[PDB]
Every structure is written in structure tokens, then in C-alpha cells.
Design a protein around this ligand. Structure first.
Ligand SMILES: *[C@@H]1O[C@H](CO)[C@@H](O[C@@H]2O[C@H](CO)[C@@H](O[C@@H]3O[C@H](CO[C@H]4O[C@H](CO)[C@@H](O)[C@H](O)[C@@H]4O)[C@@H](O)[C@H](O[C@H]4O[C@H](CO)[C@@H](O)[C@H](O)[C@@H]4O)[C@@H]3O)[C@H](O)[C@H]2NC(C)=O)[C@H](O)[C@H]1NC(C)=O
Length: 115
């Protein structure tokens, strides 16, 4: 917890695109930033962004083709995740995990889904 990472309440509707909100203590160079999103009990990653691009070789099957970050906003500390066509199976506890040149941090988020 050497850097600040914060989530805020995030909730979507089933069948519609959603957002999982995460912010962090912003770093100066994009190359120093790593974002990882995890979901409780899930073997693969939800999403990873490293060296200015997505790195999804270890992404869990439940999220293949369904996730994006805001690559233009990572430099200002915006680690929010876009989730395509939210499903009831997406509900649960997520973790936003951040590395910068100044250290690391993480915060959890409870994502809610409903009709
Ligand atoms: C990081 O940078 C981005 C880009 O500028 C900002 O993006 C906006 O984020 C807000 C939420 O903070 C978005 O509004 C939310 O949209 C959700 C649906 O999102 C998907 O679909 C739309 C297209 O229809 C896309 O624009 C979006 O990128 C996703 O693909 C809704 O589910 C949200 O509603 C929920 O939260 C609100 C409170 O925020 C509740 O009141 C609702 O009841 C519900 O629970 C919400 O409406 C907005 O569309 C995004 N804009 C753009 C241009 O993409 C982020 O804000 C920023 N995040 C940081 C800094 O933390």
C-alpha cells in the first residue's frame, strides 16, 4: 500500500455495458504503470495493462473479448474498466491492483448487476 488506490461504487444493468471504477496516485510516465483487475475466485486475470497496452495472455475465459481500460486516461490515474454486455455472472468482488514507479496499491470493489 505504498500508493493510493481507490474504487467507488459500481453497478450496471444486465445486457448493457458497464464500468468498474478505480483511481490511483498518478505517475509521470506511462511505461512505469501496471494495472491488473482481478475477480474473487477467478483463476485468470480480468484485465491487465502494462507498458502502455493491454496484455491479455493470462486473461480468464469469462472475460475474453469483454474488457477494456481507458488507455488515454491511465496517465492521469484512471484505471477504470469497461465491461461489455454485463451478465449476472459478473457480479462479485473485484480488486484493482496498481504498480507505478512510486510503489504499489490495491482496492476492492463490489460490482452489482441487476435486471
Ligand atoms: C475514466 O475515464 C473515462 C473516460 O473519460 C470516464 O468515463 C466515464 O465514466 C462514467 C462513469 O464514471 C460513465 O458513465 C457510466 O456509464 C456506465 C456505462 O458505461 C459503459 O457504457 C457507456 C456507453 O453507453 C460508455 O460510455 C462507458 O465507457 C462504458 O462502456 C453506467 O453503468 C454508469 O452508471 C452507473 O454508475 C452511476 C454512477 O457513476 C450510477 O448513478 C448508475 O445508477 C449506475 O450504477 C455510468 O453512467 C461514462 O459513460 C464514461 N464516459 C465516457 C466518455 O466513456 C470515467 O469516469 C473515468 N473514471 C475515473 C476517473 O475514475
Amino acid at each position: 500500500h505504498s500508493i493510493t488506490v481507490t474504487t467507488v461504487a459500481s453497478a450496471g444493468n444486465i445486457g448493457e455495458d458497464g464500468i468498474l471504477s478505480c483511481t490511483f496516485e498518478p505517475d509521470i510516465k506511462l511505461s512505469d504503470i501496471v494495472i491488473q483487475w482481478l475477480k474473487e475466485g477467478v483463476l485468470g486475470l480480468v484485465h491487465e495493462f502494462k507498458e502502455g497496452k493491454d496484455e491479455l495472455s493470462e486473461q480468464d475465459e469469462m472475460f475474453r473479448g469483454r474488457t477494456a481500460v481507458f488507455a488515454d486516461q491511465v496517465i492521469v490515474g484512471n484505471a477504470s474498466l469497461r465491461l461489455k454486455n454485463v451478465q449476472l455472472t459478473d457480479a462479485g468482488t473485484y480488486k484493482c491492483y496498481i504498480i507505478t514507479s512510486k510503489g504499489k496499491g490495491n482496492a476492492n470493489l463490489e460490482y452489482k448487476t441487476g435486471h
